[model samples]
Target: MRIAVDAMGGDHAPKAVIDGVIKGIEAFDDLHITLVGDKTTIESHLTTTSDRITVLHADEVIEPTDEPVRAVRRKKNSSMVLMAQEVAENRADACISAGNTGALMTAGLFIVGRIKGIDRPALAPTLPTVSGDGFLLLDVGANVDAKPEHLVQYAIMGSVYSQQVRGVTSPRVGLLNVGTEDKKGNELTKQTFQILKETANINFIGNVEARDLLDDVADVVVTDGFTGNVTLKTLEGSALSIFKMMRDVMTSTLTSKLAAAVLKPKLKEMKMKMEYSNYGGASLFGLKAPVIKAHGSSDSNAVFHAIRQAREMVSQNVAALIQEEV
Candidate 1:
């Protein structure tokens, strides 16, 4: 299967993104990458002589500031749009980009299209947990203004993905709310919870509080885009702040630095858990084809991981299983 990478879509652009692709190719012998971006820029960073990696030049770059839906027309040769089109045309098995999140969402909806019966494709991700058991978070950023039906769809999609991709049998599904009680929550959660209760297939576990997140309480956490997006950013920001605080604490004194050196590995691993790029990018679920959204700040390792994730995703038939189950 060919994995398409957006050559120019992130903060680090071709350099870091290319590096990630190369790393992914190196790690997975069966994986092949199609780099889509400016010819010279992508080619310049290459040091490997592997047939697995292929480059396709896209003259225009899709800047993050550009309006997502509108920019697709102006930047015809842009990596974001072209990569999606490639998947649509069956040139690749999966497509990945770390560019503008909005653009990726728009392109996936308009260019790649969605599976039948899927109202809105959700950006679902497996978030690492402190207990060593990761949980799948759905509607991470897609379907921001979701209704009860939309959220119910997320639970079904999330459960299907968790079962198929993550090897979770009878995955426990949770709705993000202020309390674990079914009676608690706003109108959206109330209706969604009722629908989930009535659903025969899913193992709905009722509400999951934000405080209980990252604790491995539920296998699948279904939430609206607004809460999901805020929760993701809050986790990311907190991780960064904690890392910085630890660094400051370590550097302030000679003894602290010495102790930090001894425990640096564990500390770094903790921070890596919250990194967006660490897991590569978020998966764009519900698409007819598999698509991954790489973190704009992704490096070679991140890209490589994303590639591996995509291969695993396809091999597991995660998206297709969701289509069937839903």
Candidate 2:
């Protein structure tokens, strides 16, 4: 499959992006990558030779501070927009960008378009759990204020993705709310809970509280973009703070240092699981084609994993399955 990559979109620009693309070509035999950025910039970073990689010149780039809608509309030749256009025009199977989050969402909606029955596309990312199998969270930042019907759609789309890509037999979907009771949240959550329970398409479990998120209580968690985004940020911050506290406590004294030496290996493993680079990027579900939004500060390792995630989506035909199901 052919994949379009925004070469000038990440913190480490053309160099890191090119390194990841080369690594992807080596890992997957039939994969081809089309880098979308300045021709000269990308060319300078081409260290090793491979016919599986090529370039699509796009001199412009969408900065993080640029307004999403305006940037997507006005910057026609920007790397992010051009990358989405490649997928929309059938030139590539999927596209990956580690650029501005808002701009990528706008490009996905305006340039890549949406599926037939999908009103709004969701940003679904895998949340690592204690059971070794991660749970999927949707509507993370795509549409902050989604309707009750939109949550229902997210449930269906999230279910299909979990079952197909993640290899869950019958994914259990849950509504993210303050309480597990039926009438526990605001009007939106209450209404969405009722609709999800009635739907026969997904194995709808009841509501899931934030406290039980990492316990693997549900395979798919559905919420509006605003709540989901806030939840994600909170989880990220908590993890970082806890790790920092552990590091300080471990090296506080000579006695603690000896104990830390014994636990260093296990601590490293836990740290890897909490890292964002390990999962790569979040997939924008409900789009006509697969469009991934990698973290803005992604390095070569993160970009490589992002491309790997994109490949898994393509191989599993996620977009086609959602289209057929919807």
Candidate 3:
């Protein structure tokens, strides 16, 4: 499968992103990479391999500070926009980038285009949880001002993704709310809940409370971009706080240090269990082609995971499936 990537659109830029692409290509021989950036820079890192890797020229680049729509229009050769054009022209199976997420989302809307009737596209990913059951959160900063119908579309798309991508056959779809009760949320969620209950396409499981997010109470958790973004950051903050307390506890005394040593392996495992990096980045749902968005501050490991996910997404025919369903 061909995976087109933006080589100069992250905090680490061409270096770390390229390294990740190389490592990912090494790990998956069947995967081909279309590195989009300056030819010289990309070639400096990636070796010549006719069958597996190829360089695509994109002289312009979209900066994190640039407006999404303006960049898409003016930066014709920017790696991210070029990759989008590639997908538009069927030159690549999927496009992956760690650039300005808003720019990426804009490109998906303007270049990749949305599936018919998909009111608003979404960003969804599987986040690791303490409960050992990964959670799928949708609309994590795609459309902050989503309408009720847009949220309903996110639910349907997220449910389909959880099932097709994560193997949750009958994914329990839920709306994020102040409480699990029917009348607990504002108008958007209140009306959304009503639609979800009547909608036969999704397995609506009522509302989900933030406290039970990691409990695996629902397979598909749906919310507006604003709420989903807050939830994601909240989970991240909570994880960091807990780990900091653990560190303090371990270094409090020599005896505690000894105990920490004994549990080092377990702690390492726990850290991985709480890692969102395991999934690399979010997938832009409702697009006509696969487009994985990596973290702007991604290291090679993060980019590597993005590549793996890209390969799987193409292998699973995710875009076509989305077209058929959404």
Whole-model Cα lDDT of every candidate shown, in order:
0.82, 0.87, 0.83
Q: What TM-score should be assigned to candidate 2?
A: 0.94
Ranking of models by lDDT: 2, 3, 1
Clashes of 1: 4
Residue-level error in angstroms, candidate 2, position 314:
2.1
Instruction: State the lDDT of candidate 1 residue by residue for 70-117, as single tens digits.
Output: 898777788888898888888888999988888988888888889887
Query: Candidate 1: misplaced stretches above 4 Å?
Result: 254-270
**In candidate 2, residue 321 scores what lDDT?**
83
Compose the digit string of candidate 3's lDDT tens values, residues 1-326: 78899998888989888888888888997888888999888888766434477888887888878899999988888899888988899888888998999899999999999877777789987887656568789988998998988888888877777777677788899899999998779988899899888888888999999898888878889999999999988887888887777666665665654575645654784456455766658999888888889987788888999888778778887767766664
**Model 2 lDDT, residue 165, Cα:** 75
Better of 2 and 3 by lDDT: 2
Best by lDDT: 2
| lDDT over C-alpha atoms for residue 234 of model 1 | 92
Off by over 4 Å in 2: 254-270
Total clashing pairs for each candidate: 4, 0, 1
